Design a protein around this nucleic acid. Sequence first.
RNA 1: GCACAAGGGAGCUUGACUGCGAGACCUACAAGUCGAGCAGGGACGAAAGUCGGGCUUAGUGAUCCGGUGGUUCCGCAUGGA
RNA 2: GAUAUUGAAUGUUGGUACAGCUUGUACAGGAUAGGUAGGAGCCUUGGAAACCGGAGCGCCAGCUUCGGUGGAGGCAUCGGUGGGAUACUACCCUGGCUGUAUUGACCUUCUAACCCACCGCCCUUAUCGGGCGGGGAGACAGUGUCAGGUGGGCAGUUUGACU
RNA 3: AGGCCCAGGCGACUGUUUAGCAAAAACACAGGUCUCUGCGAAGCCGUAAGGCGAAGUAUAGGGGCUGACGCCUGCCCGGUG
RNA 4: CGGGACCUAAGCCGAGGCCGAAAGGCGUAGGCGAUGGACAACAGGUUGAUAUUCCUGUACCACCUCCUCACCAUUUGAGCA
RNA 5: AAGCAGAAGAUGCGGAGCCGCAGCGAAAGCGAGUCUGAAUAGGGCGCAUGAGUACGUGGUCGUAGACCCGAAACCAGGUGAUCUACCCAUGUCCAGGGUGAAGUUCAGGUAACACUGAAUGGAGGCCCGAACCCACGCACGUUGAAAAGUGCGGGGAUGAGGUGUGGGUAGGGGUGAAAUGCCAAUCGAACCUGGAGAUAGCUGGUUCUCUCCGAAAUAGCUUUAGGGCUAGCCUCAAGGUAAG
RNA 6: GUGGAUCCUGAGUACGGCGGAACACGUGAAAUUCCGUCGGAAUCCGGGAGGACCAUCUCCCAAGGCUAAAUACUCCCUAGU
RNA 7: GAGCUGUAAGCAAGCUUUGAUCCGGAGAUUUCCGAAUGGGGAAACCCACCACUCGUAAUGGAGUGGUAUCCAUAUCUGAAUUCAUAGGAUAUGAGAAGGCAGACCCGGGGAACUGAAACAUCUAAGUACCCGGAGGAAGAGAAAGCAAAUGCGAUUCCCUGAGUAGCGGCGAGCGAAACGGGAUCAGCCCAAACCAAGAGGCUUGCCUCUUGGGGUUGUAGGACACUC
Lengths: 149, 58
Amino acid sequence: MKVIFLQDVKGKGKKGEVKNVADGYAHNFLIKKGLAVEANASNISALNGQKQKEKKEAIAELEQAKSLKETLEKLTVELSAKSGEGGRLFGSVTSKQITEQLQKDHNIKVDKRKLELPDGIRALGYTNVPVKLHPEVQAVLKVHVKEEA
Amino acid sequence: RKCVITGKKTTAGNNRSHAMNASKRTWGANLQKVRILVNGKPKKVYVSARALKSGKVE
RNA sequence: GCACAAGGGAGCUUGACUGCGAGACCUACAAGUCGAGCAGGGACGAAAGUCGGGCUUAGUGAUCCGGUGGUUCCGCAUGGA
RNA sequence: GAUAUUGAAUGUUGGUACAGCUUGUACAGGAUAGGUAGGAGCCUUGGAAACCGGAGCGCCAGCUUCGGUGGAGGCAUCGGUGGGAUACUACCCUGGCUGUAUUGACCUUCUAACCCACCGCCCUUAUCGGGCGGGGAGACAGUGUCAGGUGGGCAGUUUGACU
RNA sequence: AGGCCCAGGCGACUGUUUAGCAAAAACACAGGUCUCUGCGAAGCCGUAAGGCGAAGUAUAGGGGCUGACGCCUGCCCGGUG
RNA sequence: CGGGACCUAAGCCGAGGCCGAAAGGCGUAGGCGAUGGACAACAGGUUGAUAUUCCUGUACCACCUCCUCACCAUUUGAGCA
RNA sequence: AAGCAGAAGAUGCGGAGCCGCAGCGAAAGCGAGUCUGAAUAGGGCGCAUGAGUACGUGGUCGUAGACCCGAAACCAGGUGAUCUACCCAUGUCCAGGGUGAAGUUCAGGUAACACUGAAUGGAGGCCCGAACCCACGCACGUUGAAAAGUGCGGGGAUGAGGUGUGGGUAGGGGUGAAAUGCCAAUCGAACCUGGAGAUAGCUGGUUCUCUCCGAAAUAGCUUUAGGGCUAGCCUCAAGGUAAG
RNA sequence: GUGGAUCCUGAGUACGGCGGAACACGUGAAAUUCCGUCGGAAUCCGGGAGGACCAUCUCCCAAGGCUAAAUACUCCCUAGU
RNA sequence: GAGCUGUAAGCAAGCUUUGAUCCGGAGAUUUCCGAAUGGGGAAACCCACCACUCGUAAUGGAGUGGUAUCCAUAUCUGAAUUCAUAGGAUAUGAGAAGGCAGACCCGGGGAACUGAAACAUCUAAGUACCCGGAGGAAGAGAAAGCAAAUGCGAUUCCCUGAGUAGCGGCGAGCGAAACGGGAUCAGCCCAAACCAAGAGGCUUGCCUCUUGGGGUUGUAGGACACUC
């Protein structure tokens, strides 16, 4: 008979991998182990409800996130840092410094892992910092640094 | 000896061989002693296979 | 019983046909046998006339149930099957 | 022996939903021509000619293919063939292969059900059984259906008449 | 309250049997032999549970044949199991 | 005294329970079941019928105080089992 | 007819329904014609030579037991192990005498037990023989005293033994040292009640009188030969009527 | 009473293969129904029946349930034949 | 309304016009066994527990009531196993076992003799018998029916159809239906869909679970909207 799998059959099937499972063995194994549940109207409707709920939740989470994140990321942000003779910067503003800047200036609250910068800016100028806002969408951040005192 | 769910029991009938002899015969029921929660608890009583498929839970 | 061939041979042929059948023998019944003659096509023979198996008597057994061919037949409402 | 109780695999042989493509001459012929439409053009350093190995086919005519060296030319309407012209879209299943999921069967190992006339506890002063917990096998066996073989162990009968 | 002896047949012996015709050369017997059975033995009773085997475990338990003891059980596995 | 207010074997009955068209069969616990086990009376007479049952003597078994008595103990506390 | 009203009735209603008047052909179908057949032919079945219907008596027939008695046997449901066969639990009985095993002790004796002889020994499905049990040879009984005995002798008589009490095996079965033996005087399949008034091609019996007539023991067939059908022979009634 | 935007009208069942039974019907071409196995539908734009089966037509909505009346019998009572 | 205490003679003794015997209606009592029910049981027998009562100085003894099993409700417990269950204890229960009449009826088993001149299909016959249930009747019953016409409209039973169709070693034998005419006369509820309330599951905004409102049909009906 038909069942709504709760875990892996040949791979995690929590999504409700409807199949035909040898009613005898199906009942015995799935019920003794909870591997699945009967595929009746009630359970099917409950699964559909939970699935659409989570789908819309994720859709909203991604939509709300991408839009304003990109829009604001299209802004300009600047800071100050001392520099020496010959353009040899005394330090380097890593991702942590940029995170602190965006947290204290504009209150963007982006993770230090989602926003990464390995090159370790050492120049006294402007630069665009890409961000991993979305696995399929990204935006740049116009960071700036200038001499101080 | 009968299915608890439906009135399935041992019936009787003839056994007509070649020449149409009329030896008497019995007809059993394909019932098994599986665990079912007919009442508030399981009891492990007899139940017919035809009724077991897509019917009461074991 | 057949020498007037029913016996021997030579030619053409398939009447070793189809529907029948007045009237008779035998028989408890079933059944069996002879049959002039009518019609449709024919064969032989110029014609007449013969041919509905062997010169005559044994060479075969029913009903039911099955199979094949033909049917102005019937065909569980109607038309088919 | 088949089926329900009674399924999971590892490989395995057909068919499905996705996919991979190739087989084609009676002769005429430069040849290997199946046609019906679009057809005056196509591939060329994302490389000609030639060269060689392997895969395939075959009406043993030969073709194609792919692996690559060598490298600037090859192909085509048009000249002739004959029933029908060669560059791109397709089919007719004539012809062989590999991958994913089901699909059903064959032969392999596991365990879930089924058993317990194996035990420990409780029900319970109980050598019945029945719930729990371990072990043993285990899709077996037992059980209900259908079929085949054997079956005087058993049952109902028959075994003629004249003389 | 025993008749005995000589000689042979049958059965090793004691025992059991056709109440109500036959007490025996018949039956059984201890012995031998073949065969089945690895334990939920096999066989048996019963439609099934449940029981005999057996509070047994291949020197133990069932089935057939022959019947102590001395010598031997010879050939044929074509036919049927 | 023979048996019942004492026990138990074979065997039967048998809550629950296991089986099985029905009826019903099997069986746990439990209980029945002597033909067994344990148990306190014996000696002389009496009438026409009864008598180790009646009469006359000596006795025994189980149990309770209205009393009787001596013992211990009333919480390493007598006593019962 | 059922049915309705009606004294359990007669009667009235009730034409639902059945038979005949038209038959032939399997059927379509046709019609005093129809079927067969190619066919106005021939032949088969009918009219043209119309009389049936509903009751009552009587004869006969078929179904019910069907003329009366008679089986052996079969099936179903029940009763029986108080007789007998076996088994289980628990008790009880076997008067007396003889034999003498194994073993044990001693003596002899061998290097050593082997071996021999004496003393105790009381084993035996042992012997003789009472009670008890079984009946094997002969007589009487066989309308007996007795629906299986008595009289004399006979075998066993401490292990397969006899026996009391209680219990189990119930018939398509049980039991059986095994004879077709026992299972309540019955057993090659116990007894009681039902199917059941089983069936009988078999035997026996079948009740008042007179009168008219008057046979057969033959052919065919037959799972049939002592049975049954047809025909042959008999009788009764109506016709042809003078055919024999 | 009016509309067919949309929803319902009795599922492991109607049926089918296998082995039987009863319907007058004996597996015969065998409808219809009940049975024990396995397979298993539509559900109104639908389904069942009209003696195999198919199309048209005709009739009706199963797999839910109840229902007195005319009908059979007399052990017994009252009265009478 | 004047003989009666039986059959049944009596011998004896008593009741009755304040009204007997007798007849009918409704009641009281009803030893023991028996489904038998506290346990056992060789039917009419024996042995107990708990309460109340009689009596002894106590036991001993005696009178009344309750004390079987299954099943329904409820309450307290509730082991393996932690909750929980199986199970155990308690109160309510004109609940229930049994035959009956040797009959009628619904269903489950289920023969043989017999007939076919044997006999196996068949008949005997779903007969006898056995089993389980109730009723005065039971079963069936309002068309997923008959039927083929300007068509009837729940079942049941009677006469016809009819010993016709048909079944059958196509034998023996078995055996209808509908139309038609009669006896009676009654049609109804549930599920499904939708709606009100609540409960649990969170099927997390959806699901089923329970009472109620609802509607029941083939010219299709109902829900839904509306007219009533």
